[PDB]
Design a protein around this ligand. Structure first.
Ligand SMILES: CCCCCCCCCCCCCCOc1cccc(O)c1C(=O)O
Lengths: 206, 200
């Protein structure tokens, strides 16, 4: 924690382009990006990062065993409701397995949108209104902040986007109010331990 | 086609410091840079320019803006502002409300989070009298600037790479452009550079 960064969020763009530059099809890029994911997760866990939130931008897993091993707590954020029910149980089971883990919290955005995220936290507040439990004039920023995804973690300190586009693309919105935004042209499958080091270094400075 | 630009105008104080001057002199060179940006936007067919002053002028500039066919709006929490200022804002907005050129939104005591929370306070008062009908489009209709073109481009001068609680909901799909140029120095050429970035 020289870098002092508790919660990094990453928009992992560039898989497709990475594959095309090599004359390979899209699928090769995705497999390469998966390897980049494991590399990043390791890095975060070995550098005292408290939370890493990953957004795969334009799937599945046997990593859970390995994550659970490294005391990583796994959370899926997004609208899982529509997922075919086998999928939902698998997610639930992976979350329940690692729920008591105390190392890195790894949030993996799936069918996630920043606006959806805010909207659903609004529903909850609007729920506790109808129950007559809370007044409409009582709603403040801290309030609505306790009902959006990852309210329980440290605030997002750093958002990295690879692949060259300079936009949020409906990823976290409420939660990035004060975050450092770091954009790199590096494509996601080449984004390595030094690039991640590069990013944290730049967060340090203000 | 860039329709709505939003600017986080940072670096006035640092500019003053850099010039061997006190803070107030940075604030006057900042005001000039506002006038330059406003003319530029109007001159290049931008529909909406939203300006966030980041680390009172109505009677000085309102007549010129009206002349120039600019519609003025203030966004932010002005509830705790003097009653006279509130009347002037109202008057100024009313005076320019039919102008057909640039819409200039000035963000005064504004916060992105505050803007959503105050949109949330609205729906929650109507819930007190359907919490499966509050969806994205419904909340969008209660956030600032919903009736205008969506923000295409957010410019932040002064070398910081953050949004600093400016538009949040509104910038979901905007291009974000960060420049080390300090606001008082941000000119037409710099504005073009940013429009170029948006074009690619
Ligand atoms: C085509 C028409 C040309 C005429 C254009 C007229 C626009 C005139 C506005 C100039 C003054 C800037 C006040 C708004 O921003 C601020 C708000 C609060 C505190 C500040 O320090 C500032 C700041 O200095 O950046």
């Amino acid at each position: 924690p020289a870098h002092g960064c508790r919660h990094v969020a990453i928009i992992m763009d560039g898989n497709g382009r990475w594959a095309k530059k090599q004359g390979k099809i899209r699928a090769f890029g995705h497999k390469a990006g998966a390897k980049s994911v494991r590399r990043a997760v390791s890095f975060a866990a070995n550098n005292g990062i408290e939370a890493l939130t990953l957004y795969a931008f334009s799937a599945l897993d046997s990593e859970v065993k390995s994550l659970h091993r490294h005391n990583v707590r796994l959370r899926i954020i997004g609208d899982t409701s529509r997922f075919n029910s086998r999928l939902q149980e698998r997610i639930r089971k992976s979350e329940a397995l690692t729920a008591g883990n105390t190392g890195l919290t790894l949030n993996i955005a799936a069918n996630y949108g920043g606006r959806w995220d805010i909207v659903q936290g609004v529903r909850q507040l609007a729920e506790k209104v109808q129950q007559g439990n809370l007044q409409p004039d009582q709603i403040d920023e801290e309030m609505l902040n306790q009902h959006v995804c990852m309210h329980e973690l440290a605030p997002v300190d750093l958002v990295i986007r690879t692949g060259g586009e300079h936009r949020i693309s409906n990823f976290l919105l409420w939660q990035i109010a004060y975050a450092e935004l770091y954009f790199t042209d590096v494509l996601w499958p080449d984004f390595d331990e030094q690039d991640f080091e590069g990013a944290l270094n730049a967060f340090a400075n203000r």
